[PDB]
Write a protein that binds this ligand. Sequence first.
Ligand SMILES: Cc1c(/N=C2\O[C@@H](C(F)(F)F)[C@@H]3[C@@H](O)CCN23)ccc(C#N)c1Cl
Length: 249
Amino acid sequence: QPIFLNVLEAIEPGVVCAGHDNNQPDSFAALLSSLNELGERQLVHVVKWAKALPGFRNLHVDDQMAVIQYSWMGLMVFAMGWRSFTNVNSRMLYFAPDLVFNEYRMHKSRMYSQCVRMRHLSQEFGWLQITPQEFLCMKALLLFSIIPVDGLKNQKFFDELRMNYIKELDRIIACKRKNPTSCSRRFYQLTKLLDSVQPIARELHQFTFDLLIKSHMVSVDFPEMMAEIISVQVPKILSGKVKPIYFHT
Ligand SMILES: Cc1c(/N=C2\O[C@@H](C(F)(F)F)[C@@H]3[C@@H](O)CCN23)ccc(C#N)c1Cl
């Protein structure tokens, strides 16, 4: 009352810096090494955040880390889109206060197309007039949006958790949203927005995987924790063993 939203607001991560050297000419090697470091810092925070979510400990211990790892990229993308919207009106990609991507950096990073999709996702927060509370509920739903095609250790607990988060988003749209037809229109919009995160995360995963494999050749540094997740968990996604749960299609 509103207990659920109270929680989401309480656990939302603070500012996370990349540690990028902005006082020197951009280089593909430097920019990507900084995204890798930032990526690792975010994963660390995403784990603490996820573990504090209502019902999260209902999941089996093994399912817990798997769900975090599979969902990590999408969660990062979604939160980054929001920061971009709120801080710079979606004009640039606000990865961190010390790692803001303008068009030049988007190009230099060699992930221009992926950045353009992320920029579009950020613009949608404005076009759809996403509230901070809708954003928090959607980001939590995102954690429960990608699983092994052949289920988890205890799939039932996960299914119940997902259903409960869907219900929370519902209440949130209905809180001040009059008569049904409007709630339906809004749920339709948000579910479409949520689904749109998955293809972006997939493309980012593909690029990251490719870069890791050739990392030694391009002078890109991958922290050990990243190398492990990208080589062990990410291929399960790229090979189709683990897939997103789409609302539509
Ligand atoms: C999309 C994104 C990030 N992207 C990435 O992190 C690196 C990974 F290896 F960590 F995945 C890799 C890089 O090699 C190529 C894209 N990946 C990194 C940090 C944030 C943030 N905040 C966001 Cl939104």
